[PDB]
């Protein structure tokens, strides 16, 4: 079967450029055309162009001609995407998906997706609290315990609990940006009351943009 | 170019019903369409390329259907699993564009939220904030509300909601709502509450501590 | 030369009210704007270039619209962190030139304020003076008003008064009145008044000390 | 890391000169164009003009053409603006911000401000005395307490609480301008009644024109 790594998700200056990875496998790389596409939060998709590995040859959506450059390399089958000269506009997280061959086209295969963000800022690991189960019991029957990451930069953050384990009734929100300028959500659990004094939970944030690995600790009152 | 249509924006069906979209374009875009579906927090997936051959390993309750500049996909029965956004493409001509995109929900029975107080936790109180969470777990719809109330002066541009997408489990949504201020303004007060008014819940419930 | 008009120049909104504030040119500046914010003591900080594209770093709800001669910068959702002096700037020829200045204020509701009074220090005595500090703590509006009373004697050109911009805290005010006088001055007398009159104070509080 | 280290606010005597720095930083100084504006005390913002240190070519706003001159250093990415015959209409605050390339632009990235009074007048460090929190429990709850920064000269002066630690709940008042010619202006901190006899603090009050640094300490009524 297909697949398609792409490098992880980054940070930039405004100004600068940032070259995305797409490793291609499973299939016959200069065969087929390898596409990119940008999705900014929350606002759709949208179509950046194409390349042929085996030719070389691209279409450039004009609206990313001159901002986004790609490259390609057969040696290892990996496909690039240079976007320069970033501004607040090219934050978004982009994606390489396995176009068609001009051979035959059994659909679209898409990789995980590369996160990007334009910051004259500094990344910033988190600092992770506990949301202990506390008297939540009143009028209650299950209990409710979480973590809470708070200010962090930039946006690629996440969560598991007991380590992929118990992580069954989980909530992780969506993070909300803060007057700051730094990322905050919060990450919950529903679970036995009874099982609330044997069994123990950690959360396990991961924030890579700055090298964070949390494995938190949840004690209740 | 060729602008690729998409409507409803929203669209709700509950599971088994029939659900079916549309994508209309500008000028015969020759049945060179697919059909994208991108659940919360992945990457989009192919499910249906030139539009009606679907992508392998993708169930057969999903067709293509369409031709011309009026296109659309049907999914016979509807099972949780798809729950998302839905795509439409066409590559019969450069640039090649996107659909605006429909989502898809599930329509479900209604259910009031289950609501926990979370009080600020030691770690972050050694430091300079405190901040307290709210959660409103398991509920439907999503369509509710919540209300901050330190000793009973209802908040204003100090806190902060976020909801979930349909938790598959059951088809409900979740929120959480923290109200942030420092150690001190956190000692001024006594009393921190959060009123939760739903159509679930036959009257506002107040969760709230004393600490 | 490009004359950049601003108006109205004071502009008010409660957090979450959707605010909105524009700029006139003399001739198509081509788009080629930007908006800038200035916070109390702070140096500006640009939020928006080339009429509507967003510096990165800064929030969604602010949306740049405009062109040919008429420009205009809106706010969503108005968050305490927006309170300001906003300008527009024409690149667009030599040499660039600023609109005069919108400021721009939250409103909130009434709070009557904390009074509170600090007699002579030490130090300030042991040498030549000594000055009479009174504090109006976290109040709104801030159009509020103080007089100063030594001995039932209704001060005159003796005192200094000073507010501070809106603590985003609460969206709140804060002012201090300074009565000053000599040692010698400051020891005939056995009484120091601050009275405050407020709308939020039923009545005029008075803060005093004895000496 | 774009920044933009003006130097610091000073004084000088009518008729003569000031020279002032912008140490640019986190880019290729040539590249850009260094900009000027002026802000006089309560009266919105006036662009000066600018200079493109790469080519030593300078775009003057005809109304400072002769009043200000610019120039940079290369060797040191420094870029300056000498401000000559200096008169009342002079006194104001300088910003030096990053302009534009003609290769690209994101917006003007802006310096601290540099401070400038022109005046027969020495300098003259404050006298910073202690705002204790007295008998300010008689139907109150919270307790304030500040300090006083009286009689300094020229009008650049800063405080800040605990070194920057707890700072929150603090009221730095604009400077007023007293009979005497100096200035004077107050600063409190809102805080817990309790924890007043155990936790102390400081205010830090500096005025750069004379080089003062006090770290004075506020005695509980």
């Known amino acids: 079967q297909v697949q398609l790594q792409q490098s992880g998700a980054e940070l930039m200056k405004p100004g600068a450029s940032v070259k995305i990875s797409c490793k291609a496998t499973?299939?016959?790389?200069?065969?087929?055309?390898i596409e990119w596409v940008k999705q900014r939060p929350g606002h759709g998709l949208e179509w950046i162009g194409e390349?042929?590995?085996?030719?070389?040859?691209?279409h450039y959506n004009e609206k990313f001609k001159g901002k986004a450059t790609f490259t390609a390399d057969k040696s290892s089958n990996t496909a690039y995407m240079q976007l320069s000269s970033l501004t607040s506009e090219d934050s978004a997280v982009y994606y390489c998906?396995?176009?068609?061959?001009?051979?035959?086209?059994?659909?679209?295969?898409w990789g995980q997706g590369t996160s990007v963000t334009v910051s004259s800022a500094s990344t910033k690991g988190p600092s992770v609290f506990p949301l202990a189960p506390s008297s939540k019991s009143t009028s209650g029957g299950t209990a409710a315990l979480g973590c809470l990451v708070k200010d962090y930069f930039p946006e690629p953050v996440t969560v598991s609990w007991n380590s992929g384990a118990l992580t069954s009734g989980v909530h992780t929100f969506p993070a909300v940006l803060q007057s700051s300028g730094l990322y905050s959500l919060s990450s919950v659990v529903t679970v036995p009351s009874s099982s609330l004094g044997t069994q123990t939970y950690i959360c396990n944030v991961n924030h890579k943009p700055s090298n964070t690995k949390v494995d938190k600790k949840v004690e209740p009152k | 170019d060729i602008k690729m249509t998409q409507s409803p924006s929203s669209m709700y069906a509950s599971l088994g019903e029939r659900v079916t979209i549309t994508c209309k374009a500008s000028?015969?875009?020759?049945?060179?369409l697919n059909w994208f579906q991108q659940k919360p927090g992945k990457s989009p997936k192919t499910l249906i390329y030139?539009?009606?051959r679907l992508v392998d390993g993708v169930p057969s309750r999903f067709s293509g259907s369409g031709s011309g500049q009026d296109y659309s996909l049907t999914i016979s029965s509807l099972e949780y699993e798809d729950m998302g956004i839905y795509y439409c493409?066409?590559?019969?001509?450069?640039?090649?564009?996107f659909g605006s995109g429909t989502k898809l929900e599930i329509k479900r029975t209604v259910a009031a939220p289950s609501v926990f107080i979370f009080p600020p936790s030691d770690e972050q109180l050694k430091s300079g904030t405190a901040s307290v969470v709210c959660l409103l777990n398991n509920f439907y719809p999503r369509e509710a509300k919540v209300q901050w109330k330190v000793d009973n002066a209802l908040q204003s541009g100090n806190s902060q909601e976020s909801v979930t997408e349909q938790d598959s489990k059951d088809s409900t949504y979740s929120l959480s709502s923290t109200l942030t201020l420092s150690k001190a303004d956190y000692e001024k007060h006594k009393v921190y509450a959060c009123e939760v008014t739903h159509q679930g819940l036959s009257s506002p419930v107040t969760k709230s501590f004393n600490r | 030369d490009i004359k950049m008009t601003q108006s109205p120049s004071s502009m008010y909104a409660s957090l979450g009210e959707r605010v909105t504030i524009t700029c006139?040119?003399?001739?198509?500046?081509?788009?080629?704007?930007?908006?800038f914010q200035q916070k109390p003591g702070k140096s500006p900080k640009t939020?928006?270039?080339?009429?509507?594209?967003?510096?990165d770093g800064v929030p969604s709800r602010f949306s740049g619209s405009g062109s040919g001669q008429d420009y205009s910068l809106t706010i969503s959702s108005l968050e305490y962190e927006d309170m300001g002096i906003?300008?527009?700037?024409?690149?667009?020829?030599?040499?660039?030139?600023?609109?005069?200045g919108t400021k721009l204020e939250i409103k909130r509701t009434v709070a009557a304020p904390s009074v509170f009074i600090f007699p002579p220090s030490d130090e300030q005595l042991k040498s030549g003076t000594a000055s009479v500090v009174c504090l109006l703590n976290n109040f709104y509006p801030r159009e509020a008003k103080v007089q100063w009373k030594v001995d039932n004697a209704l001060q005159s050109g003796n005192s200094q008064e000073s507010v501070t911009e809106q603590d985003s805290k609460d969206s709140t005010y804060s002012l201090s009145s300074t009565l000053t006088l000599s040692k010698a001055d400051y020891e005939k007398h056995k009484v120091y008044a601050c009275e405050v009159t407020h709308q939020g104070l039923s009545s005029p509080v008075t803060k005093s000390f004895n000496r | 890391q774009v920044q933009l280290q003006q130097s610091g606010a000073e004084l000088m005597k009518p008729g003569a000169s000031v020279k002032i720095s912008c140490?640019?930083?986190?880019?290729?100084?040539?590249?850009?164009?260094?900009?000027?504006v002026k802000q006089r005390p309560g009266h919105g913002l006036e662009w000066?003009?600018?200079?493109?240190?790469?080519?030593?070519?300078?775009?003057?706003?005809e109304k400072f053409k002769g009043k200000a001159t610019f120039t940079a250093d290369k060797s040191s990415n420094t870029a300056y603006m000498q401000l000559s015959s200096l008169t009342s209409e002079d006194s104001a605050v300088?910003?030096?911000?990053?302009?534009?390339?003609?290769?690209?632009?994101?917006?003007?990235?802006?310096?601290?401000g540099t401070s400038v009074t022109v005046s027969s007048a020495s300098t003259k460090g404050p006298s910073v005395f202690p705002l204790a929190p007295s008998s300010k429990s008689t139907s109150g709850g919270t307790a304030a307490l500040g300090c006083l920064v009286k009689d300094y000269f020229p009008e650049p002066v800063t405080v800040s609480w605990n070194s920057g630690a707890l700072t929150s709940g603090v009221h730095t008042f604009p400077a007023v301008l007293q009979s005497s010619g100096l200035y004077s202006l107050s600063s409190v901190v809102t805080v817990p009644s309790s924890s007043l006899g155990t936790q102390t603090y400081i205010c830090n009050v500096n005025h750069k024109p004379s080089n003062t640094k006090v770290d004075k300490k506020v005695e509980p009524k």
């Open positions: 000028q015969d875009i020759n049945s060179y």
């Open positions: 998906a396995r176009g068609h061959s001009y051979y035959f086209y059994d659909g679209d295969y």
């Open positions: 030139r539009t009606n």
């Open positions: 499973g299939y016959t790389f200069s065969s087929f055309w």
């Open positions: 493409l066409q590559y019969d001509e450069f640039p090649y564009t």
């Open positions: 390349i042929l590995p085996g030719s070389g040859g691209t």
